[PDB]
């Protein structure tokens, strides 16, 4: 239901009404774009694995084990 009265003539309000209706539908019916998920970048994964491996190396040489010395 739409009340169009802004203009001074019914011949103008009679198109103001249809304009309001079509402009309503044209956005109350929109199909908003679907947001697909995003995956971590290749370079970011590479940096993660780099840091992980360097930490692995330092944490490995950081310790105490009798491999050689019986």
């Amino acid at each position: 239901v739409i009340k169009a009265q802004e203009y001074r003539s019914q011949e103008l309000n009679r198109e103001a009404a249809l304009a309001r209706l079509v402009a309503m539908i044209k956005e109350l019916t929109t199909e908003k774009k679907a947001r697909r998920p995003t995956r971590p970048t290749r370079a970011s994964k590479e940096r993660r694995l780099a840091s992980k491996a360097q930490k692995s190396s330092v944490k490995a040489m950081r310790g105490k084990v009798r491999s050689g010395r019986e």
Partner: protein, 123 residues
């Protein structure tokens, strides 16, 4: 220090809070699992850990890990939750006892089968 100061305002005990509040000193709590999905670990571990969002019988809606490889947990599965942080997903402070309350055990886990709730191969 200063025995008089201790007499006036005595030393105290820092009450160590519990890291499993939703259990509130109960070993296990059942939940409905209002969500069930996967989420990627924090910085180094680069995976997709299976997690769920549950509503327990004490109102504490909590995120709970989903142990093992493969499962059949859904929107309305009555599950059972024990403590234990995941240390990987920030926020998961609980788990699920696999192999009880609608949760299936991993497929024929030969090791750690008391865990992960799988019956034994009868031999």
């Amino acid at each position: 220090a200063t025995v008089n100061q201790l007499v006036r305002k005595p030393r105290a005990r820092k009450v160590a809070k519990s890291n499993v509040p939703a259990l509130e000193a109960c070993p296990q709590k059942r939940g409905v699992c209002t969500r069930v999905y996967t989420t990627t670990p924090k910085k180094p571990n680069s995976a997709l850990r299976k997690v769920c969002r549950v509503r327990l019988t004490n109102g504490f809606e909590v995120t709970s890990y989903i142990g093992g490889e493969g499962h059949n947990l859904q929107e309305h599965s009555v599950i059972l939750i024990r403590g234990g942080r995941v240390k990987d997903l920030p926020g998961v402070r609980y788990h699920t006892v696999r192999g009880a309350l609608d949760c299936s055990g991993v497929k024929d886990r030969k090791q750690a089968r008391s865990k992960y709730g799988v019956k034994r191969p009868k031999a």
